[PDB]
């Protein structure tokens, strides 16, 4: 009965998605080729047109979408917003056009759900992250005061110290490159660095594991709802309802 309705049906098809995916990939491949500094002037010119085309197909797509759903209903979705900004900002002649390839995530549903699970897991680890942040800040202040005068390249100011401490937490050359040189001047520096490592590696892995365990559960419920309209009821609710059926046959057997 309606134009709008027939467009939404197009937008939401599997073929349309495949086509926009193919254009993202192509845009991506062309921006990759353009890294090649040896290119002829005409080749670069060509590739830049392919990019122009890709960007155009993107504006038609988003247009189609803002029409078929209306200004307020398109902007209802973070993903549409994201798609919109990514495409919009390219219409302002920043220099990292290649971020356009993140649209593979916004356009492919299973990929969107991976990202959604990870974003959704961030709140629940916020206290673990804050504890890490506090540990970092305190360590960076002490390292600057302790070591900044004698090791200024690594600890000369707070910024330097944070950088160095991040390197130390990743275990990268922590000993041969940082702590042994420091200990030649400050023999007890292991008393600072080895507890720092123990605590940050424990906390970071806590942070990581919390994100991953949650993100995987969220994603998995999203995949279920996407396929069947509902998710698995948690065992605890299943046992709750079993508790109810038991109450209703205990009460029924009064007489």
């Amino acid at each position: 009965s309606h134009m709008s309705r027939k467009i939404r049906d197009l937008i939401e098809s599997k073929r349309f998605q495949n086509v926009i995916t193919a254009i993202i990939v192509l845009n991506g491949a062309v921006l990759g080729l353009l890294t090649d500094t040896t290119l002829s002037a005409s080749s670069q010119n060509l590739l830049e047109r392919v990019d122009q085309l890709c960007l155009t197909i993107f504006i038609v797509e988003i247009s189609l979408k803002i029409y078929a759903y209306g200004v307020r209903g398109f902007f209802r979705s973070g993903w549409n917003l994201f798609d919109f900004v990514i495409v919009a900002i390219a219409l302002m002649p920043r220099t990292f056009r290649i971020f356009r390839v993140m649209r593979l995530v916004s356009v492919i549903p299973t990929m969107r759900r991976v990202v959604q699970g990870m974003l959704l897991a961030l709140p629940g680890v916020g206290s673990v992250a804050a504890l890490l942040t506090v540990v970092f800040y305190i360590a960076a202040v002490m390292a600057t005061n302790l070591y900044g005068a004698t090791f200024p390249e690594w600890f000369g100011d707070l910024s330097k110290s944070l950088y160095t401490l991040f390197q130390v937490m990743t275990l990268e050359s922590w000993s041969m490159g940082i702590v042994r040189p420091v200990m030649n001047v400050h023999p007890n520096a292991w008393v600072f660095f080895i507890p720092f490592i123990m605590l940050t590696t424990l906390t970071v892995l806590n942070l990581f594991i919390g994100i991953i365990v949650d993100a995987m559960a969220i994603t998995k419920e999203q995949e279920e709802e996407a396929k069947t309209g509902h998710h698995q009821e948690p065992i605890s609710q299943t046992l709750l309802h079993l508790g109810d059926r038991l109450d209703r046959i205990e009460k029924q057997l009064a007489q």
Copy 2:
């Protein structure tokens, strides 16, 4: 009543498996000795005959098998196919004969099941892997543009950048060897590299954990079915059936 049937019984015995295992090991040991560049001409000649023998015993084995199961029923199995190719390609006088030792996996059932679990887990992490791939590709394009002119050995082209970024994701000399040298020329490069590390280490570990958790469950169900013909019913189905027995005694107590 049948030749075929008596051969299949041989093939499927525990003694036959032990014998083929022993020949794989021996083939493997001889290819190891042949790495020894100091060997006398006669020793090498000997070892090469032992390999020839090993390969022959393999053709008889596979023959036995294609006969006792017929062309279409042998080629029904990925493992038979794999065994077939590995042995076949050696009959074309590639240079990595040592891959023959992967037959330890195809011939030993518990080992086959480990590999089966890992292959079977690959689909379920395909979106996590694709997200990693996207992150890599985008990072490699930006690193080439940002750093290729000033650091061409590490970022001079897309290939270089991908390699370097893989090294960076593994945390290997990421700071003393790559990022500190880069920052002497581009002082804000930590703004690129430290988020890259955070995101890829999170995603890779997500990838790893997903594979392992699934592969372990799959393998474990395979080990159960191999031993008893069935696996453990998931708790959720057990609770489902408990829900059914409750319905049938709630309905029965109508009167």
Copy 3:
């Protein structure tokens, strides 16, 4: 009806907490600025007053608290004790004032619960930690005896050996920096170092995983009790009570 009661209500408000949080942050920011060695004499003087103020607001706070709860009831809490010491020791004109910023943990409840979970998990991994400790001590004695005379910088005495072995367990330059140089003199040293690595990396990760899995469960029960006054009953107790309702309807249907 009471002063005490109206103060406790202030102390326990959300606004009061926000205010003490803001003062910790500010104290923290000022101690950070003071790392900056380039500061004018007047700037340093200013910042030191801001610290003096911050410390004062802290004494009023703790005073308020010891009054509104009484000496014995304030000192009932580890966190109050901790808050008390941190603030008290600053009234003794040690040099790491920046530890004051750990009060973000004692004053923010969700952060307190993260730390509480980790402390509470320590007992249950105490045997895994002791095993690691034993492995370290034995390794450090043997490394000193084996390698101390020929590699005294790394193994010259027990202290040196422990340090080196910690570095080796973290995998930092273990081979190019320590074990290959050692093997040029003692060709079988891989027989010591590679088992050391296998065993300590297995044990440390066991230690880490045990802490994290437990700390996460404890923290999560604390967050529940903080919000609703109780936690989730473990599935095992739920099944226990289900077993009871079954007994009471099996016994009831005697006649």
Copy 4:
């Protein structure tokens, strides 16, 4: 009524255990002091007597034990056997006496149970370990053939290659120290090394996680049985028995 019985009661007391623990620690402390190469002749002499004493107290202990339980019942226990060998071999005037300190594990029950869980978990990961072993062996043969002539220090023979590949699997200097130098001569060597890393890091972590998850469950059941004489019934058996109580009230309500 019996000597034997009163000795076993002594052996099995908490005070006796504390005393043997204290002697292990002391033996351990003295062997540590003896690493100190600067010691006076008389100090070393003293410490060596303390060791002699410690070893003597150990023989009385084991004697007490072989008597109070009899030759066949003492040798029934792996831990007694282990205690016996450790003490016995010292009566043969090998040079790593410090292994005596592993008796802290055999004498302290919670520590014994950690080790027991890890030993008991080894069978269930045997296939994952064998797969790793196969991957290593094949990689080491190919690396020797590919790279041995041009990089003999790292790949000159099978032993060298295994060592290098272990280093590579731990990610230690894998790129700046091994693979970049190799690629200057063999530009496609990343095609060998990067898949090697992906596969071995996945497999090793699978190995590690399998050991730890199992060892923790085993240990935890052992701690339960040690305290209460039984362990927790697995949920699956609890649900089985719930299924039985349901059958017995479905069958009972026939009439």
